[PDB]
């Protein structure tokens, strides 16, 4: 199933995944397409941040599901 991931710049990405894929695996897919590190990515859906150990089914996600990816930074 291809899911859509929208960022904070009016941009959306489609990734062919499955309901048994881990969030860390999804962040890695976006890292290969956009070229951004997974550690600097935050997947949020239905007003809930997804864990890297949990999968897409743990948060009730289906095909063509939209997600909110964010970019985290550091200071020190």
């Amino acid at each position: 199933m291809q899911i859509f991931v929208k960022t904070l710049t009016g941009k959306t990405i489609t990734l062919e995944v499955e309901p048994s894929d881990t969030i860390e695996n999804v962040k890695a897919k976006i890292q290969d397409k956009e070229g951004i590190p997974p550690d600097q990515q935050r997947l949020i859906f239905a007003g809930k941040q997804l864990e890297d150990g949990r999968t897409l089914s743990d948060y009730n996600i289906q095909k063509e599901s939209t997600l909110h990816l964010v970019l985290r930074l550091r200071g020190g």
Partner: protein, 111 residues
């Protein structure tokens, strides 16, 4: 394998394996202390002279120009959806607002 040797790693592991890396991290800790002390002391002096419990008079002219001038400039110009101003929760407030408060279906959409 893991490679248990000595030349395989003797510089990019810990500062204890180099007096230049051990002193480099010690010089940085000292600088952070000056910022954590000069800044922690500035707040300790403003609180001691807020109620009157020390030997002070009126020290708020040089920093007042630094705070009043930056308080209106840093927190005054804001007429655009700047993303850098939104933190991880502020940016999340926008992504969660459309995910939780972003849906037009109602009980009249049979398609």
């Amino acid at each position: 394998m893991l490679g248990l040797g000595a030349s395989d790693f003797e510089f990019g592991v810990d500062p204890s394996a180099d007096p230049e890396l051990a002193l480099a991290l010690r010089v940085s800790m000292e600088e952070q202390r000056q910022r954590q002390e000069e800044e922690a002391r500035r707040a300790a002096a403003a609180s001691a002279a807020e109620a009157g419990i020390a030997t002070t008079g009126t020290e708020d002219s040089d920093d007042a120009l630094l705070k009043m001038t930056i308080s209106q400039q840093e927190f005054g110009r804001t007429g655009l959806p700047d993303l850098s101003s939104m933190t991880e929760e502020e940016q999340i407030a926008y992504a969660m607002q459309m995910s939780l408060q972003g849906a037009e279906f109602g009980q009249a959409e049979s398609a």
